[PDB]
Amino acid sequence: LPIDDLDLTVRSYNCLKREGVHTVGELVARTESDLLDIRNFGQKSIDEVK
DNA sequence: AACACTCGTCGCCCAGAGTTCACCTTGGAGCCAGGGACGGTTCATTTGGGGTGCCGGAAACGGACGCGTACAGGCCGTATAATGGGAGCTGTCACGGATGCA
């Protein structure tokens, strides 16, 4: 499933589509620590992803 | 061994990336209405053409028909005198019985 299908807000889509994350399969493959590593990552994005 | 200087690190503070959320337009995509000319169809010619069955007959042609020639096979005759075969090579044994003689 793509991350857009999760019907989320501005920042998470922006910071994901620049770097080529297209699905939630790679997102569930990546752990919370491996996804929070990104510079200027929103804590609200962390909350919604968790 | 005693003494007086300059550099990451972090937080914090303001501006937009660019994204979402969310407002007006206008070229529509199509839907329908109307008008050819057009190509498909059909039907009048149209006499240009294919057509032909048979023949006078001319000439080939297939064969009959009669009459010559050709070797193949057959018949026939040869007048000094010429008057009874070469050849075969045979080392069996058993043995039953006829068999020409006993």
From Swiss-Prot:
Domain of life: Bacteria
Coiled coil regions in record: none
Inducing factors: 3-fold repressed by starvation.
The family this protein is said to belong to: Belongs to the RNA polymerase alpha chain family.
Function of the protein: DNA-dependent RNA polymerase catalyzes the transcription of DNA into RNA using the four ribonucleoside triphosphates as substrates.
Quaternary state and interactors: Homodimer. The RNAP catalytic core consists of 2 alpha, 1 beta, 1 beta' and 1 omega subunit. When a sigma factor is associated with the core the holoenzyme is formed, which can initiate transcription.
Domain notes: The N-terminal domain is essential for RNAP assembly and basal transcription, whereas the C-terminal domain is involved in interaction with transcriptional regulators and with upstream promoter elements.
Protein's name according to its UniProt entry: DNA-directed RNA polymerase subunit alpha
Organism of derivation: Mycobacterium tuberculosis (strain ATCC 25618 / H37Rv)
Residues of the full protein shown: 249 to 298 of 347
